Amino acid sequence: FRPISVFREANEDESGFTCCAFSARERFLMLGTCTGQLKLYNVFSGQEEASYNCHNSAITHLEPSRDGSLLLTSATWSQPLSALWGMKSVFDMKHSFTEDHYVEFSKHSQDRVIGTKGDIAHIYDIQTGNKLLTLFNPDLANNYKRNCATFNPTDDLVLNDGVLWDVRSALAIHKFDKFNMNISGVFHPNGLEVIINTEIWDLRTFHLLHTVPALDQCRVVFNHTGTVMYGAMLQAMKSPFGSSFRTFNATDYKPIATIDVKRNIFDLCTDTKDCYLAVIENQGSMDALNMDTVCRLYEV
Numbered sequence: 001f002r003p004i005s006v007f008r009e010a011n012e013d014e015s016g017f018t019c020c021a022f023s024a025r026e027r028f029l030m031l032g033t034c035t036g037q038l039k040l041y042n043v044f045s046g047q048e049e050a051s052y053n054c055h056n057s058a059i060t061h062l063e064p065s066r067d068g069s070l071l072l073t074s075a076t077w078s079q080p081l082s083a084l085w086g087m088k089s090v091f092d093m094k095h096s097f098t099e100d101h102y103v104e105f106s107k108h109s110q111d112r113v114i115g116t117k118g119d120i121a122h123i124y125d126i127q128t129g130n131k132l133l134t135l136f137n138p139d140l141a142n143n144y145k146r147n148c149a150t151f152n153p154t155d156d157l158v159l160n161d162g163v164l165w166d167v168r169s170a171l172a173i174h175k176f177d178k179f180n181m182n183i184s185g186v187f188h189p190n191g192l193e194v195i196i197n198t199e200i201w202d203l204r205t206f207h208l209l210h211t212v213p214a215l216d217q218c219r220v221v222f223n224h225t226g227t228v229m230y231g232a233m234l235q236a237m238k239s240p241f242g243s244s245f246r247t248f249n250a251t252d253y254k255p256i257a258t259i260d261v262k263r264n265i266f267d268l269c270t271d272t273k274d275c276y277l278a279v280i281e282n283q284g285s286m287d288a289l290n291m292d293t294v295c296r297l298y299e300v
């Protein structure tokens, strides 16, 4: 993990990057800010190339589409709280998700959006913007404080609130027991395993495969080949993670490394060639008047 590049936000006393994802264009990183702006930066030069105001509150998440034509955003207290933006020719808003606090694309074919409102998942058609399904069973809920509904790699399962749903039947097939208060779970890209905080479960048998204590309270990201798993722990805007990330072998969940960057972490993401890890790091403490974040680029 060699440092390659570092930059702060242009024309800012105090630097406000909150989250990042690589653009479909090679050398260019998208970043959200605490004033609800989307910015496009040269990740090597640190030159700000473009700026749009998407929301009148801080960006909490973004995800570009694989084909570079679409972008999802989520903000903090703005209405609408999340939105879908078009990026071909002019930048403009296509649809808005009035109360969804988090949104993701479908993974296999990026024709659908899945949004989260508290305990409840919503699915949307991208063309029409219509709500196709609501996935919510109050007898099966876990009430995860940081619930984030997500499609599996083939788009036919959904994890919401520790419940596995079958998208075609709108049927709850399994509720995983609650073993923490905050983390709801992601799908392994291999389509066989789901990862919920420190537990790894099998999708065909529901047997526990692994305990990984160092994942506690971590947000999980995979590299694009699905051979490496990165973990950023949430904190005991304000700083969403503490100051270290762990890397694990994705097939056997053995630790490769614990990197301590000595700064609280806001976000991290991989490029599509698994060449680079981009990390948002706060130089200030939680008690500073203002945020002071930088984006560091590391070679992996």
Ligand SMILES: N=C1C[C@H](c2cccc(Oc3ccc(Cl)cc3)c2)CN1
Residues within 6 Å of the ligand: 030, 031, 038, 039, 040, 050, 051, 052, 090, 091, 092
């Ligand atoms: N109203 C408009 C829309 C248009 C415009 C202005 C600035 C920037 C831009 O592209 C961006 C911005 C942010 C990201 Cl992350 C990616 C691309 C488009 C010209 N005028």
